Amino acid sequence: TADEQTNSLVITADQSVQEKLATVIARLDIRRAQVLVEAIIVEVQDGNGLNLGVQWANKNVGAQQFTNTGLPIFNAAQGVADYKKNGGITSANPAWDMFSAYNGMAAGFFNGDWGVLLTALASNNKNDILATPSIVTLDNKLASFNVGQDVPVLSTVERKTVGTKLKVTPQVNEGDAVLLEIEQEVSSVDSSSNSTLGPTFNTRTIQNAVLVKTGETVVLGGLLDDFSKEQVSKVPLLGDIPLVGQLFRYTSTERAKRNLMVFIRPTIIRDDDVYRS
Amino acid sequence: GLNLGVQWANKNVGAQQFTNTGLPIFNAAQGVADYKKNGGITSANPAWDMFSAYNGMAAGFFNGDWGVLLTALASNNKNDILATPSIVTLDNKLASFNVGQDVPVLSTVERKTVGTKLKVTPQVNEGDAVLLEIEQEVSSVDSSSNSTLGPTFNTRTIQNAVLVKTGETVVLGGLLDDFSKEQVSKVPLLGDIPLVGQLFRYTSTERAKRNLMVFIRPTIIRDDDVYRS
Amino acid sequence: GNTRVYYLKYAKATNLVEVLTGVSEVAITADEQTNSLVITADQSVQEKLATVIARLDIRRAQVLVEAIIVEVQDGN
Amino acid sequence: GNTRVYYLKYAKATNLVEVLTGVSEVAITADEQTNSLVITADQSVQEKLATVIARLDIRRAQVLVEAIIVEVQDGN
Amino acid sequence: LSKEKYTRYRQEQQQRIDGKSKALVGSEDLPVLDENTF
Hints:
Function (chain A): Involved in a type II secretion system (T2SS, formerly general secretion pathway, GSP) for the export of folded proteins across the outer membrane. This subunit would form the outer membrane channel.
Family (chain A): Belongs to the bacterial secretin family. GSP D subfamily.
Oligomer: part of a larger assembly
Number of domains of chain A: 1
Strand content of chain A: over 45%
Subcellular location (chain A): Cell outer membrane
GO molecular function (chain A): identical protein binding
Keywords (chain A): Cell outer membrane, Membrane, Protein transport, Signal, Transmembrane, Transmembrane beta strand, Transport
């Protein structure tokens, strides 16, 4: 039986059993190693959209119009004409909300009776992330490291921690290496797309067991995700003319890339002197 | 962060406009024109809320019939934190130290302590060192982003067992988090001209860094005389 | 000694105990802290379980699994 | 040795144990980590179960299954 | 196996740092992994 206060163990038994349990305890009482576990989460995103279109409207012949240009030739020509007669545009003009939100160069050109309207926008974004959660713990003891925020989620509600999380149980076997059972994720509340049902969260989660040598950086996982979209709205024969055909079509292009890598570097602390340094 | 953009609007040719500049060339030109005719701007003018909230230098230039509007804002912030909770306790006895506030959380409600917390059970083995089972966190109520479901909290939590020598300062954990964002909205060919191209694009850049470290220094009190000093 | 304490390397003591228990079923119990296995039994059983554990303690292989999902859509 | 540890290749130790149990019903138990099977029994039973396992451990075939669903509708 | 993913990712970041052109405003790059690793 044990004394939990003094952390001492009380064995009553024959002198023979005592000398045998004295060796079992001495074997089982040994000092246990510590493991410094660094995770390295690198992600890089980028993508570039391009959407340009030409619409020409003619009173004598007719008009070519593309919604999704962000303004159509019809609603623009009603707004431009209204702007010339009144010298300005009131907020009640239906074209107000159409011009008030628009991005890119809209260049109109009038040749004779032909109106022509060119809309062009090329978007480009880039994103890069680095995280390096690290934790020190004894082998066979479960350690967890949370940096993030604790948010309510509906269900009556419930509390959910969402952030950079690292939960690892090391096993040092033996001498060098280790057995790391890793459960980690980088999650965050998604500001856009709120709902009455609750918040969403952007989660990148990886859980696996791996056996890594004591000094080495090794890859736990990763995702290389790549996406390319395209759409054109064209006049059927004219839009296919090799060069000139771009006047009739409205093209909207998009691309995306996500390259994610997760690395883990364990380090074993055998003694104090290496754990100062 | 840095977000700067140039938008030029021309009556004869057309206009280049970027929302996310905080004001577009269209709504600004309707506001500036309204300001010239009336000598002022009423709160009913739709451009009121757009000019009333704006940050950075907005410099317009009119050359002939060409209007040109430059918006530039460079934000920079910095933050630094230090906390040093300490606790004295007998070995094998669990001690806890809370400095913070006790807030209600919805579920009918429930009480939750949120603050600087240190919960440690020492084990002195033997002579020097110790075995510290640490559960600590620094958490706080998030003033922004309140909801009908309840408050959120910014939590930094670390729980591990570690064995530290009696005098030594050692690292329990840490997080080095670094983030860089970028966005441009440009005119497709013109925006790529190496130098001049910055006139057509609207760039918004951002960066962040967080470097967190957690250290623990145990000290063993064998006798009274060392625990006075 | 009647009782030996085996320090397992690459095996989990709690896991090993269940497997061992059938072989013994001798007392086999594990220390989850030090990840060591405690077998008390006759010198004859000890030398036989020492080989069973050595066989069952081996290092286990790792697998890198890449999936490749390619999709292409189009229509006019 | 009284107890042998069989390293299964192409078979799952937990699965094999159930099948074996009837044949033995000798103690058969499996290590789910290393995917090895632990049989303790007389030298006579060992040599007989060594052939049963070798028969039951074989590599299993894979099947690529393509379905083709063609539909055509029209009406005027 | 880890060194070729660590380097192919690092050499991709270094390509993106050189792929951006001066005289246009752009995001300042992160520190690219570590050279002394492996």
